[PDB]
Amino acid sequence: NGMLYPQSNDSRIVFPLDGVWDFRTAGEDSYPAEWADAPLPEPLPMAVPGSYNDQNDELNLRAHYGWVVYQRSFAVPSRLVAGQRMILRFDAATHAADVYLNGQLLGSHFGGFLPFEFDVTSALHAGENLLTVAVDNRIGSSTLPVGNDAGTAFMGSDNANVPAVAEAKKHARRQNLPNFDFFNFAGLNRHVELYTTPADAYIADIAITTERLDHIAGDACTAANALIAYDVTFGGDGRQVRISILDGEGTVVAGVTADIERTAKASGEIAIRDAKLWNPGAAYLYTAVAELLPSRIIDAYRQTFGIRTVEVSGTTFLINGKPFYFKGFGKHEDSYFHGRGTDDVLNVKDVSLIHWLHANSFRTSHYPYAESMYDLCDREGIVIIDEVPAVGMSWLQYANPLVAERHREAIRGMIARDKNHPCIVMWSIANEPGLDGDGERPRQAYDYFRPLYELAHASDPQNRPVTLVCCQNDYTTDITERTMDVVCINRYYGWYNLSGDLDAACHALNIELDFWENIGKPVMFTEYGADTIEGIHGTHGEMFSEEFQRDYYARINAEIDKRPWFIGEQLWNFADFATFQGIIRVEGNRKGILTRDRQPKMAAHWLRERWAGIPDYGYK
Amino acid sequence: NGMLYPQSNDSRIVFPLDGVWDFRTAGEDSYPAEWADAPLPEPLPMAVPGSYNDQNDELNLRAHYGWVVYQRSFAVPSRLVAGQRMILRFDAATHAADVYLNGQLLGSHFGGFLPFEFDVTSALHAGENLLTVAVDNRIGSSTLPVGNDAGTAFMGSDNANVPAVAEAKKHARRQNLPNFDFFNFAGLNRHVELYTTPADAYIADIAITTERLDHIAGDACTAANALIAYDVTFGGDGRQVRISILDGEGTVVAGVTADIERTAKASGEIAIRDAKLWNPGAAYLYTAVAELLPSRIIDAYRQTFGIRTVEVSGTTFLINGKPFYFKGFGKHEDSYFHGRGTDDVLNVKDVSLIHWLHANSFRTSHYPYAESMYDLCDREGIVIIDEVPAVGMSWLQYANPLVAERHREAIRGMIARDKNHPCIVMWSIANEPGLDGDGERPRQAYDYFRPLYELAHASDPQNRPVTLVCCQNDYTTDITERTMDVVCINRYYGWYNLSGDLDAACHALNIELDFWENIGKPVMFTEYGADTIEGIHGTHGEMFSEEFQRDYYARINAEIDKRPWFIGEQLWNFADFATFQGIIRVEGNRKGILTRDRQPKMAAHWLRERWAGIPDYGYK
Ligand SMILES: CCC[C@@H]1NC[C@@H](O)[C@H](O)[C@H]1C(=O)O
C-alpha cells in the first residue's frame, strides 16, 4: 500500500532511468509484444519524463489513438544489486502501461497519474538490461478521466441533423473523445527510477499525523505541546525501530524506540514541547527519521512532515484553530513542450508566482500532481486541495463496477501517496460529476459518491475534510454537494450564462448564495473566470478582453465578500493551458490569469493587489 | 418609387448636411418631443455619417437600447430655394427614424439600410433651420433584421436549468437580442443631404436595361449591336424628354427625343452599334442623359449604366454569353470607429484589396450597402450579389403580416435603388432563414418565400437571377433552396461540425455535393470558413490558427474543383468584423481572411495565389 518516494542513504540507492529513450507509435488497440525481446526497430527519440504528444512535429502525435512503446537499456554494478531488493518505479504512465524487463512481462497498471512499481530482483541480470514500456492513451466510458465512446468532445460543436455529417461521422478517424476540458497528454509523464532496499527486512511505509495541539500561541507559530503519531510498516521475513524527530536545524528534539509487532508494523505517539507549527505563509518542517535496528543500522527512511491541525467547524475552516481563507486557483500540469510532463523548473517558478500573487492555495485539478510539487509547497507554505482524476463522470459511470473500482483505487492511491504532506488540507473525490436532475438520478449520484466520501475519510490517518467539486448545476435538485465537509463550487455566472452582463451575473450569484447561506456549510469557489486573450483591450471591457476578466473578478469578489460563511476564492485558471481543439478554445483554455508562458494579464495585477490586503487568518 | 441619388447640374443643386451634429441618448421606448422644437439641451457631438455606438467611450452606447436624437442647424440662400422643389434625403437611418424640421413632423421610416426622403419645400424657412432626427435601434420578432424578444443573442451561451439564472434574466437590463451574427450598429449610418429639383415637372426615376446583344465578340469586349431600353418617370403637375447616350469618353453615340405619356412616363428602345460591354475585370460605362424639354432645359439627370446580359443556363452562369465563375466572399460594412457607417476611403481600399486577391465578386451580406460602393464596383468591374436585410428569419416571422410587408418593402426598395448597376448580377432575398424540418414547416417556408422570389423577378427590369442564401441544414427536407435560380449555400463542414477533421469534413461535403449534382441547378458557396486569430501558428494547424484556415480552404476548394456544376466560391468572410459579445466571438467574428484592419492572414495569400490562376470566364 505504501508508496514512499525512493530515497538514497546508507542502506538504499536510487538509480534514475530518465533521459532520451527509444520510442515507436503502435496500433489503435494493439502493439507488437516481440518488441520487448529486442531493440525497437527504427526508433524515434523521446525524452522522459514528459508527454510524447508535443515531442515530434513531423508526426501529429496529438492525434494518436491507442498504443505507443518506450524502450531503453541500462546497466548497474552487480556489487550494488547483490543481496538487495530491487524495485522498478514509474512515477506516472498515462494512462495505462504494460511493463517488460528483458522480455518478461512484469505486469500492468491503469492509473495515469499515480505511481506504481515492480519487484525486479529476479528479472534483473548483469550487463545491459532491456526495458520496454507500452503506454495506452485511450479514454472512454470506463476510464478515469472519462472519455466518450462516440460523438463529440466538450463543448464540441455539431450539426447532427445533417445526413452527410452523420454519415461521415461513422467513417471518421478514431480519436479519443475526452470527458474533460484539458488535452489528453499521454506517455511517461513523470520520472522512472530503479531503487534499492535491504531484502530481509525493510521500511515499506510511514505515516505521521498531528493528533493534538495544546495551548496554541496567538500567532499559531507554536503550541506548548503537540502530540503526533507514527505508523511504520515493514516488509520482509523482538525487532525494533528507532524514531527520531529532527527540527528545522537537524536537532533531535524527540526520540523513541518502538517494538515491531506482527504485516509487521510499529506505531505510537510522541510528545513535542513548544512545537513549531506549519502554517500557510509560514511553513515549518520536521523530519521523522525511522531506523530499523538489528549500534549499526539495517534500514532507514527520512520522512518530512509538518505539525498542524485541520478542522471544519460550522462555517469555518480552521488551521491550527485559526479561521483560514483560501486565496488561489485551480492549476494544471501543463506547459509548451512537456505537456503534462513534470518540470521542476516550472514548479519552482509557479510557486514563486503564487507568492508574487499573494495567493496561499491551489487545487490539483484534475489529477494528482507530481510528488515534488507537494514537497515544494510543504517547504513554501502553500496549501493544497488534492484531487483524483474523477472528472467527466455521469450516470453511465455510476453503474460501472470497473469505474467504481478504479475510482476507489485512485482515492486510496492518492491518499496513500500524499498523506504525510502538511500542505494538503482537503481531499477532492471528483470534479464536476452529474449530480442533479429529476427522477432517481440525484439519489443514484448520492449513492455512488457517499461511500467514496467515507473511503477518503477512512484512508486518511489525519482525517482531513473531504469535498467534491461541483459543476454549475441545479443546486435545488443536487442532493450530494451539500453533504460534503466543504462545499466547493464552480460557477460561471456572466460567462457561460447571462453573458457579459455583470449586474445580472451578480444578481444570480446572490440568489444561489442565499440558497447556500441556508445550507449552513462552509462554501468556496473552486472555479470561476473568463477566457481572456492578452492584448485584447477595450475602454468598456467585453468578453475576451483583459478589462473584462478584471471587471469580472472585481464584481464577483465584491459579492462574496458580503458572505461570512464564504471561506475561499479559487479561480479558474492559474495559467492558460492546452485543450482538445474546438470553437470555444482559442489555442486552448484562456481563462488563465497568467498566459501559458506565465505572464500576468491585467486581472493578475488586480488580484495581486486584492490578495495582498487579505490575510490567511481572520479575514472572516 | 424612384430614389435617384441626388445630383448637381444646371437644374439641380445638392447641399450635404453631413458633419458634426448634436446628439442625445433617450429612452427605451420614447424621447422628449420638445427636443424637436428647440436646441437639444447639453448635446454630445456625433459625426454624420457614422454609427453612434463607437463614437463615445465615456458612454457604453453599444449597450444602448431604444432611441437617440440627432440634431443640427443649417441655412441656405433664399435665392437657391426660390421656385424649387426642396427634398431632404436620408441615405440610411438604422433602423427606424422620426424626422422633424422646425418643430414640424415631416414623417417616419422603418428600414435601416435603404434611403428615404421628405418634401420640405413648405417646412423650410429663411435663415437657420432646425433639423431633428430621432433614431430607433430596436430589433425584435417583427423587424428586418430579426431580433429575439427573449433569451440569448445569436450563437449565445446559456445555463437555463439554473434557477438563479432564470430569475436574474427577468430583471436584467433590456438589450437588443440579435438573431444575427453582426453587431447592431445604429444611427445615421449614411449621408444626409438637402437637394433641389424643378417644381412644375421633374425627373423622378430612370431605368436602363440591356434588352439584347447581337453577335458578341469572342473576347466579349464588344457586340455588333446592343439593344437597350429606357424608362423615365416624371413628377410634377405634348411634353418631351431627350435621351442622349454618352460613351466612356463623353461622346454622344446615340440620342432620341421621346414623348411623355400620362403617372407621367417616357419609354422606348435605343440601338447601339459596336457597343462596348461591361465585364468582370473589364468594366465599361455609358451615361444616359435625360433632359426634360420645355434650346433651354427644364430638368436633367445623368444615369450611369453598363451594357451586359446575365442569364442562367442549365448549370452555367452566363455573363455576355460567357460561363462566369464567382471568386470572392461575403463582406460587411464594418470598421473600427465608423461601425456600419459608410466610409469611401475604406470602400476604395477594399475594392483595391479585392483586386489584389484576384477576386471578382462579393455579396452585400446582410443588407444593402451604401450606393457609392455600387458605383465603385461599376467602374472597377467587380460583380455584386445584392441582399436585403432578411436575416434571422424563422417560422415565427412567416406568419407575421408586418414582417412580410417589410420584406416586400426591402426587396422593392433595394431593386428600385440599385436596378441600374451593371455590377449587380443577382438578388438575394434572405440569409439563412429556416427552410427545413418535418411536418408543414418546409411547406410554410416555401409558401412564404416563393412570392418574394416572384416579386424580385417582377421588380427588376433586367430580370436578373434570384437566390436565397441557405444555412447549413437538412438539404433533404428543404424544398425551397432548390427552387432558386442559383443555389447559394453556406457550409461549415470541419468547423461547426466534424471539428478540426478535414478528411471527414471533405467526405461529408462530398456527400452533400452528390445530392446537389442531381438537382441540375448551378451551385456556389456564399459562406465557408474558420475563425482565425492572426499570429496563432502551429506546424499542424488547429482551429483558430492561420495554418488551419489555410488548410481548410485548400481541402474544401480541392473538392469543389471536381464539380463542373459548381460555379462559384464566396467565402466567409472578407475581413474580421464586430459582433455581439459571446463565448465563440473573440473580439467579434474572426473568419476574415483579412484582419479588421485589412491585413492578410496566411489564408489570404494562399487564396490570392489560387485565384490568380482562375479566369473569370471558362474555368468550368
Ligand atoms: C464546465 C465549465 C467550466 C469548466 N470546468 C472544469 C474545467 O476543467 C474547465 O476548464 C472549465 C472551463 O470550461 O473553463
Ligand SMILES: CCC[C@@H]1NC[C@@H](O)[C@H](O)[C@H]1C(=O)O
Ligand atoms: C451560423 C452559420 C454561420 C454564420 N452564417 C451567417 C453569418 O452572418 C455568420 O457570420 C456566420 C458565422 O457564424 O461565421
